[PDB]
Protein backbone atom coordinates (compact mmCIF):
# COMPACT_ATOMS: atom_id res chain seq x y z
CA UNK A 1 0.00 0.00 0.00
CA UNK A 2 2.61 2.69 0.88
CA UNK A 3 6.29 1.67 0.69
CA UNK A 4 7.04 -1.93 -0.27
CA UNK A 5 5.31 -1.59 -3.67
CA UNK A 6 4.90 1.43 -5.97
CA UNK A 7 2.44 0.44 -8.70
CA UNK A 8 2.46 3.73 -10.63
CA UNK A 9 6.16 3.30 -11.32
CA UNK A 10 5.54 -0.26 -12.55
CA UNK A 11 2.89 0.93 -15.01
CA UNK A 12 5.19 3.74 -16.17
CA UNK A 13 8.01 1.23 -16.68
CA UNK A 14 5.73 -1.00 -18.78
CA UNK A 15 4.68 1.88 -21.02
CA UNK A 16 8.28 3.09 -21.33
CA UNK A 17 9.44 -0.36 -22.44
CA UNK A 18 6.63 -0.55 -25.01
CA UNK A 19 7.49 2.87 -26.45
CA UNK A 20 11.18 1.95 -26.68
CA UNK A 21 10.31 -1.27 -28.51
CA UNK A 22 8.11 0.57 -31.01
CA UNK A 23 10.82 3.16 -31.66
CA UNK A 24 13.34 0.36 -32.24
CA UNK A 25 11.01 -1.27 -34.77
CA UNK A 26 10.67 2.05 -36.59
CA UNK A 27 14.46 2.45 -36.63
CA UNK A 28 14.76 -1.02 -38.16
CA UNK A 29 12.23 -0.16 -40.87
CA UNK A 30 13.97 3.14 -41.65
CA UNK A 31 17.52 1.75 -41.81
CA UNK A 32 16.53 -1.32 -43.82
CA UNK A 33 14.35 0.60 -46.26
CA UNK A 34 11.83 -2.28 -46.27
CA UNK A 35 8.50 -2.44 -44.46
CA UNK A 36 8.60 -6.25 -44.06
CA UNK A 37 11.85 -7.59 -42.57
CA UNK A 38 10.24 -10.54 -40.74
CA UNK A 39 7.20 -12.71 -41.31
CA UNK A 40 5.68 -11.40 -38.08
CA UNK A 41 5.45 -8.02 -39.80
CA UNK A 42 3.12 -9.37 -42.49
CA UNK A 43 2.61 -12.98 -43.55
CA UNK A 44 0.47 -12.42 -46.67
CA UNK A 45 2.74 -10.07 -48.59
CA UNK A 46 6.06 -11.70 -47.79
CA UNK A 47 5.10 -14.60 -50.06
CA UNK A 48 3.72 -12.19 -52.67
CA UNK A 49 6.94 -10.16 -52.57
CA UNK A 50 9.09 -13.26 -53.01
CA UNK A 51 7.04 -14.53 -55.96
CA UNK A 52 7.11 -11.07 -57.54
CA UNK A 53 10.89 -10.86 -57.10
CA UNK A 54 11.24 -14.24 -58.80
CA UNK A 55 9.04 -13.08 -61.67
CA UNK A 56 10.98 -9.82 -62.03
Amino acid sequence: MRIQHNIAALNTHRNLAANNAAASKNLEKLSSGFKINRAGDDAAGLAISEKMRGQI
Binding site: A39, A43, A47, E50, K51
Partner: protein, 165 residues
Protein backbone atom coordinates in the same frame (compact mmCIF):
# COMPACT_ATOMS: atom_id res chain seq x y z
CA UNK B 1 7.11 -14.89 -9.66
CA UNK B 2 5.67 -17.39 -12.13
CA UNK B 3 4.25 -14.65 -14.35
CA UNK B 4 7.52 -12.71 -14.45
CA UNK B 5 9.49 -15.87 -15.22
CA UNK B 6 6.96 -16.72 -17.94
CA UNK B 7 7.49 -13.27 -19.46
CA UNK B 8 11.23 -13.99 -19.47
CA UNK B 9 10.65 -17.38 -21.10
CA UNK B 10 8.39 -15.86 -23.77
CA UNK B 11 11.09 -13.34 -24.64
CA UNK B 12 13.61 -16.18 -24.91
CA UNK B 13 11.27 -18.00 -27.30
CA UNK B 14 10.95 -14.83 -29.38
CA UNK B 15 14.74 -14.68 -29.62
CA UNK B 16 14.89 -18.30 -30.80
CA UNK B 17 12.21 -17.69 -33.43
CA UNK B 18 14.00 -14.57 -34.67
CA UNK B 19 17.15 -16.68 -35.08
CA UNK B 20 15.31 -19.21 -37.24
CA UNK B 21 13.65 -16.53 -39.40
CA UNK B 22 16.99 -14.82 -39.95
CA UNK B 23 18.36 -18.18 -41.02
CA UNK B 24 15.59 -18.62 -43.60
CA UNK B 25 15.97 -15.12 -45.09
CA UNK B 26 19.25 -16.16 -46.72
CA UNK B 27 17.56 -19.33 -47.95
CA UNK B 28 15.08 -17.07 -49.76
CA UNK B 29 17.91 -14.99 -51.22
CA UNK B 30 20.01 -17.85 -52.58
CA UNK B 31 16.88 -19.57 -53.90
CA UNK B 32 16.13 -16.43 -55.91
CA UNK B 33 19.70 -16.47 -57.22
CA UNK B 34 19.39 -20.17 -58.15
CA UNK B 35 16.16 -19.51 -60.05
CA UNK B 36 17.87 -16.69 -61.95
CA UNK B 37 20.76 -19.04 -62.79
CA UNK B 38 18.36 -21.73 -64.04
CA UNK B 39 16.41 -19.30 -66.22
CA UNK B 40 19.71 -18.16 -67.74
CA UNK B 41 20.97 -21.74 -68.19
CA UNK B 42 17.69 -22.73 -69.88
CA UNK B 43 18.42 -20.78 -73.09
CA UNK B 44 20.09 -22.43 -76.10
CA UNK B 45 22.69 -19.69 -76.54
CA UNK B 46 24.74 -21.62 -73.98
CA UNK B 47 26.95 -24.52 -75.10
CA UNK B 48 27.68 -27.71 -73.20
CA UNK B 49 30.84 -28.11 -75.31
CA UNK B 50 32.63 -24.91 -74.24
CA UNK B 51 31.50 -25.23 -70.62
CA UNK B 52 28.88 -22.45 -70.51
CA UNK B 53 26.38 -24.34 -68.34
CA UNK B 54 28.94 -26.17 -66.19
CA UNK B 55 29.97 -22.83 -64.66
CA UNK B 56 26.36 -22.07 -63.74
CA UNK B 57 26.27 -25.60 -62.31
CA UNK B 58 29.40 -24.79 -60.27
CA UNK B 59 27.51 -21.77 -58.90
CA UNK B 60 24.39 -23.86 -58.28
CA UNK B 61 26.29 -26.61 -56.44
CA UNK B 62 27.96 -24.06 -54.17
CA UNK B 63 24.58 -22.49 -53.39
CA UNK B 64 23.18 -25.96 -52.61
CA UNK B 65 26.03 -26.60 -50.21
CA UNK B 66 25.20 -23.25 -48.59
CA UNK B 67 21.46 -24.01 -48.29
CA UNK B 68 22.38 -27.27 -46.53
CA UNK B 69 24.99 -25.52 -44.37
CA UNK B 70 22.51 -22.95 -43.06
CA UNK B 71 20.17 -25.80 -42.18
CA UNK B 72 22.58 -27.96 -40.17
CA UNK B 73 24.81 -25.23 -38.68
CA UNK B 74 22.08 -23.07 -37.09
CA UNK B 75 21.76 -23.19 -33.30
CA UNK B 76 20.40 -21.36 -30.26
CA UNK B 77 22.03 -22.35 -26.96
CA UNK B 78 23.53 -25.50 -28.52
CA UNK B 79 20.24 -26.61 -30.10
CA UNK B 80 20.00 -27.51 -33.78
CA UNK B 81 16.76 -26.02 -35.14
CA UNK B 82 16.46 -26.57 -38.92
CA UNK B 83 17.59 -30.21 -39.10
CA UNK B 84 14.52 -32.14 -37.99
CA UNK B 85 15.38 -32.35 -34.28
CA UNK B 86 12.19 -30.52 -33.26
CA UNK B 87 10.02 -32.01 -36.02
CA UNK B 88 9.61 -35.23 -33.99
CA UNK B 89 8.20 -33.93 -30.67
CA UNK B 90 8.57 -30.13 -30.68
CA UNK B 91 9.76 -27.28 -28.48
CA UNK B 92 7.55 -26.53 -25.47
CA UNK B 93 7.45 -23.03 -23.99
CA UNK B 94 6.08 -22.39 -20.49
CA UNK B 95 4.15 -19.13 -20.87
CA UNK B 96 2.29 -19.31 -17.56
CA UNK B 97 2.85 -19.57 -13.84
CA UNK B 98 0.96 -22.84 -13.36
CA UNK B 99 1.43 -26.30 -14.83
CA UNK B 100 0.00 -27.04 -18.26
CA UNK B 101 0.09 -23.38 -19.37
CA UNK B 102 2.36 -24.28 -22.28
CA UNK B 103 2.59 -24.01 -26.04
CA UNK B 104 4.15 -26.60 -28.35
CA UNK B 105 5.94 -25.74 -31.57
CA UNK B 106 7.49 -27.67 -34.45
CA UNK B 107 10.01 -26.82 -37.16
CA UNK B 108 10.47 -28.97 -40.25
CA UNK B 109 13.64 -30.09 -41.98
CA UNK B 110 14.73 -27.33 -44.40
CA UNK B 111 17.56 -29.07 -46.26
CA UNK B 112 17.92 -29.42 -50.01
CA UNK B 113 16.93 -33.11 -49.97
CA UNK B 114 13.58 -32.44 -48.28
CA UNK B 115 12.66 -29.66 -50.73
CA UNK B 116 13.53 -31.58 -53.91
CA UNK B 117 16.23 -29.11 -54.98
CA UNK B 118 19.40 -31.11 -54.18
CA UNK B 119 21.79 -31.80 -57.05
CA UNK B 120 20.37 -35.30 -57.58
CA UNK B 121 17.13 -33.74 -58.91
CA UNK B 122 17.94 -30.09 -59.76
CA UNK B 123 20.99 -30.07 -62.03
CA UNK B 124 21.18 -27.49 -64.81
CA UNK B 125 23.72 -29.39 -66.91
CA UNK B 126 21.13 -29.73 -69.69
CA UNK B 127 18.42 -27.47 -71.06
CA UNK B 128 15.73 -29.94 -70.04
CA UNK B 129 16.84 -30.18 -66.40
CA UNK B 130 16.61 -26.40 -65.95
CA UNK B 131 12.92 -26.63 -66.90
CA UNK B 132 12.25 -28.88 -63.91
CA UNK B 133 14.69 -26.90 -61.75
CA UNK B 134 12.66 -23.70 -62.15
CA UNK B 135 9.46 -25.36 -60.89
CA UNK B 136 11.40 -27.16 -58.15
CA UNK B 137 12.87 -23.85 -56.95
CA UNK B 138 9.43 -22.20 -56.99
CA UNK B 139 8.00 -25.01 -54.86
CA UNK B 140 10.91 -24.66 -52.42
CA UNK B 141 10.43 -20.88 -52.15
CA UNK B 142 6.72 -21.35 -51.39
CA UNK B 143 7.45 -24.01 -48.76
CA UNK B 144 10.02 -21.91 -46.92
CA UNK B 145 7.66 -18.91 -47.05
CA UNK B 146 5.02 -21.12 -45.42
CA UNK B 147 7.44 -22.11 -42.66
CA UNK B 148 8.45 -18.48 -42.05
CA UNK B 149 4.77 -17.55 -41.74
CA UNK B 150 4.27 -20.36 -39.22
CA UNK B 151 7.12 -18.97 -37.11
CA UNK B 152 5.98 -15.35 -37.29
CA UNK B 153 2.49 -16.27 -36.14
CA UNK B 154 3.87 -17.74 -32.91
CA UNK B 155 6.06 -14.66 -32.45
CA UNK B 156 3.04 -12.35 -32.74
CA UNK B 157 1.12 -14.55 -30.30
CA UNK B 158 3.94 -14.41 -27.74
CA UNK B 159 3.95 -10.60 -27.89
CA UNK B 160 0.29 -10.43 -26.81
CA UNK B 161 1.03 -13.09 -24.19
CA UNK B 162 3.81 -10.93 -22.73
CA UNK B 163 1.50 -7.90 -22.56
CA UNK B 164 -1.18 -9.90 -20.75
CA UNK B 165 1.38 -11.36 -18.33
Amino acid sequence: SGLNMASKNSSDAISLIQTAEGGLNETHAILQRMRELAVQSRNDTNDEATNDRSNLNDELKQLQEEITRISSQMEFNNKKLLDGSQSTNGLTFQIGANAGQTITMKISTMSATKLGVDAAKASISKGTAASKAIKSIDDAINTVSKTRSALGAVQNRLEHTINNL
